[PDB]
Amino acid sequence: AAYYQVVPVTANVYDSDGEKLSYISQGSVVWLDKDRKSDDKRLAITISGLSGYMKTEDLQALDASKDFIPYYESDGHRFYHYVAQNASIPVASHLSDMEVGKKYYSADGLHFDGFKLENPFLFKDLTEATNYSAEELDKVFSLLNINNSLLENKGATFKEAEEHYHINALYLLAHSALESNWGRSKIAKDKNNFFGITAYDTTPYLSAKTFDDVDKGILGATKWIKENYIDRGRTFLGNKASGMNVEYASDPYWGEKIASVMMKINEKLGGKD
Ligand SMILES: CO[C@@H]1O[C@H](CO)[C@@H](O[C@@H]2O[C@H](CO)[C@@H](O[C@@H]3O[C@H](CO)[C@@H](O[C@@H]4O[C@H](CO)[C@@H](O)[C@H](O)[C@H]4NC(C)=O)[C@H](O[C@H](C)C(=O)O)[C@H]3NC(C)=O)[C@H](O)[C@H]2NC(C)=O)[C@H](O[C@H](C)C(=O)O)[C@H]1NC(C)=O
Ligand SMILES: [Ca+2]
């Protein structure tokens, strides 16, 4: 088969030496890499920019004529990644080279056969501050119809986090928006944890860190990201080959999802970043 799906809760991706490179989530679809040798025990695969090996034990072959394979498609305005059969995210503007309503396939969401995407928020250095003020960030709740969020009117706390820890406040708002459903998840409400801090795939709610209030949750999560990711040389969102997505989340499209939210906010607020 050309495509395989991950069966266990997570599965590792290995290099040719058998060293772990990353891990990916249950249901993730990987491509067989025909330029490298596979055998009975391990398949050469590609996922989210990463070329490595996976154990056959962890995979199930798909038939693309009847099983869901992630793809990209333009509506003529935006280019969308269907990350799941019933979920799409906008990743880029429509290019003239895209046929509307045609399915396109890509192992990294940047290289296509007939065009190349810029996803600049995916590779942006997150130590550079946003050009949005606290009041501008606060406006996005009304502009994107975000109701009942714990993060409403916390633009000033995001900008303090940025000032103190030197982490981009648009990124911190987009990460909390994606990870905690705009501070509306049960982890957000019970634990003031908007960033999935230690929300491990095996037991996400139980493992998730507890913070004292919303402001200490924003500041404490920012400290945790600075100390565990930025200070360790993971300074952009990226994918399974580089960036925070290598370690932060099993989801191969976590970085692309946060970049998409940054793109959507930036557009609504007038494109200052
Ligand atoms: C839109 O819904 C949201 O989707 C998000 C994905 O797009 C989803 O993300 C979930 O978030 C957490 C943080 O990203 C993430 O947790 C990581 O889990 C792995 C374990 O599976 C941790 O790695 C282990 O770490 C220990 C200690 O370091 C190691 O000993 C161990 O070997 C590691 N295991 C492996 C297999 O390598 C990882 O820890 C890293 C390495 C770390 O400590 O820095 C965890 N990350 C963090 C930051 O703690 C999890 O993978 C991810 N889930 C998916 C599918 O990606 C949101 O989840 C939230 C948290 C929630 O459910 O409320 C989704 N949000 C909602 C509202 O649904
Ligand atoms: Ca190696």
Swiss-Prot record:
It is found in: Secreted. Plays an important role in cell wall degradation and cell separation. Belongs to the glycosyl hydrolase 73 family. This is Putative endo-beta-N-acetylglucosaminidase. It comes from Streptococcus pneumoniae (strain ATCC BAA-255 / R6). The chain holds residues 430 to 702 of 702 of the full protein.
